Amino acid sequence: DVLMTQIPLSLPVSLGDQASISCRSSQSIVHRNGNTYLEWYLLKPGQSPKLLIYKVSNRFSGVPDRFSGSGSGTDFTLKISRVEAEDLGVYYCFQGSHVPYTFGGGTKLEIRRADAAPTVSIFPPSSEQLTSGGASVVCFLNNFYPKDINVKWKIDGSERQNGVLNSWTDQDSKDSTYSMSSTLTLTKDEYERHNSYTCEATPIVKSFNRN
Amino acid sequence: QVQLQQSAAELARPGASVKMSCKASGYSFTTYTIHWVKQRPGQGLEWIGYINPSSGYAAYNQNFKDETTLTADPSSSTAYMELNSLTSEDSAVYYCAREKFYGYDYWGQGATLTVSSASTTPPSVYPLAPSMVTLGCLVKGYFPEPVTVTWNSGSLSSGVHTFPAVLQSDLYTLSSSVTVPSPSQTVTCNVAHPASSTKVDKKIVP
């Protein structure tokens, strides 16, 4: 099979700068008809893949002129000038010349921007959940930068590690921030026996008292 | 307008078969091929095969040929992919896309296939009630993926974060948060669970 290898794996870019992604085929991808069926796709968060470039260098209708494709032989390049926040996502090259058709492994473009502190919110278990016998304590850390953030739980002042699951969004294409949920799931039995619940973002702190 | 509309997410048992559909509208169906692409976390995108409705010919990736049959019904402008001998390796999002010499210009919306012996379980939706106010939406205990969350039937789109689900004890859970400015201007999360054909609305009260 034709192996399609992309460089780099991760492409952080500051807004307004240029960027390029390389795609190298393991053999020539010229069809016997003389065409080179090399395409570039962008997979944006929550969307189906979008065509950018076909036949090496032909922009698809609606794609801005900031995107351009070039190459021959076995090395193909996608260039983006004046990167915008809407350009984040996973870029794939693809060859449609020789069956089986093959995709590159993907390059994740991310926006590098200034640091931003999270907006932190905490929520006790709802009455509806508690009636059924479960107790989810939920904490949102919204619109922060960079992606790496530590969340810490305290239950009446003592650190709490069991029953915490964390989940991050993809990068926001409006403000280039990230958000995360942290969820402490207890039994109602366990929830009922403690008063103070804290989530700390690192230190931005939000807590409540009930049980 | 050109559109590729896939069948809904679905659950299949190990060892069974499943038939996934792609209804093409907005063009002369026989004049474009339909290709199928598999998306599985950590595995990028894989090409499965294509069918050319004009000729009837389907091409298959050798890695998929023993588990895959592609068909197309010109009369209904629908392409199908049947997967046999299912295993958990087949759990993925599957797309269809059309192609005739200018790349995959239009794609279906994708369909999540889960291969499991587990039953379908609809979500329980709980309120997360409190210049700017953050409200939310805990969507607990559903199977299989996905759920979709909107706010105010999609009329409220700005300031939303719907987090990826986490799997625990064979069930999924996720939360959605919304932020609005502090009259009769209410806030309702709308949760759809296509694999169980269930929709729930939860109006957030203080």
Binding site: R32, N33, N35, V99 | T33, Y57, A59, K100, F101
Partner: peptide, 6 residues
């Protein structure tokens, strides 16, 4: 293949 007609 179908691309021969391109």
């Amino acid at each position: 293949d179908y691309k021969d007609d391109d």
